[PDB]
Amino acid sequence: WIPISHDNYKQVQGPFYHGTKANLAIGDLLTTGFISHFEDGRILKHIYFSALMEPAVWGAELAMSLSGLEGRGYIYIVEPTGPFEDDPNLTNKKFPGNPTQSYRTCEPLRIVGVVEDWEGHPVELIRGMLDSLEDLKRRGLHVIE
Ligand SMILES: CO[C@H]1/C=C/O[C@@]2(C)Oc3c(C)c(O)c4c(O)c(c(/C=N/N5CCN(C)CC5)c(O)c4c3C2=O)NC(=O)/C(C)=C\C=C\[C@H](C)[C@H](O)[C@@H](C)[C@@H](O)[C@@H](C)[C@H](OC(C)=O)[C@@H]1C
Ligand SMILES: CO[C@H]1/C=C/O[C@@]2(C)Oc3c(C)c(O)c4c(O)c(c(/C=N/N5CCN(C)CC5)c(O)c4c3C2=O)NC(=O)/C(C)=C\C=C\[C@H](C)[C@H](O)[C@@H](C)[C@@H](O)[C@@H](C)[C@H](OC(C)=O)[C@@H]1C
């Protein structure tokens, strides 16, 4: 397993997926739903995406739940427009390496397509992460812009 950094992200093949509450068209830039999060003594602002579909399904479900909104989110096929790196939240935490192929970037995502069809996770599965994210939100440690 090879860590993805600003030195080697160009070696990562798409496609990529992003889950969100944002309602945008193909060709639009995602400048919304960046996450302000605490890391190494400061707030950083990143948008998150994956080379696999399922992490974006989680991203859409949690975007909708944290926003208190009804229904399924949106999943976009995306390209980063600047350097990206492993999401440290999902890298050498619960699993070795970055098995969900989840990445973060400081620059907007380009929407290049839409995912229409997916099977969601049961809400019970979403509740434990939502509880944790609600607390981090209250503490200003992870905040959707
Ligand atoms: C694609 O990721 C998803 C599913 C992966 O599928 C799956 C199978 O692969 C996972 C990987 C590779 C992990 O590394 C991981 C993990 O590191 C983690 C929790 C569980 N966290 N919590 C719930 C259990 N509770 C005891 C502790 C808090 C996980 O479940 C997973 C996990 C999975 O379930 N982290 C922790 O336990 C700790 C120490 C802190 C958590 C902090 C916040 C809450 C999270 O970081 C937020 C910012 C998000 O990152 C997640 C919600 C992910 O949603 C997205 C869209 O990113 C989600 C895991
Ligand atoms: C008393 O301890 C606190 C210090 C407060 O004050 C303050 C100013 O000083 C801090 C120090 C000195 C840290 O060293 C620190 C830190 O190392 C860290 C996060 C924040 N972590 N996350 C932010 C969200 N993001 C999506 C995931 C990573 C922090 O906020 C802090 C932090 C503060 O905020 N984390 C990480 O580096 C990594 C790599 C992962 C952590 C994973 C989970 C999420 C955490 O373990 C959860 C379960 C909590 O245990 C902490 C958040 C503590 O919060 C409480 C109330 O217990 C906090 C350390």
Automatic annotation (TrEMBL):
Domain of life: Bacteria
GO molecular function: transferase activity
Residue intervals of the Rifampin ADP-ribosyltransferase domain: 16-118
Pfam families in the record: Arr-ms
Keyword Transferase among UniProt keywords: yes
Keywords: Plasmid, Transferase
Entry keyword Glycoprotein: no
Gene3D superfamilies in the cross-refs: Rifampin ADP-ribosyltransferase domain (3.20.170.40)
Name assigned to this protein: ARR-2
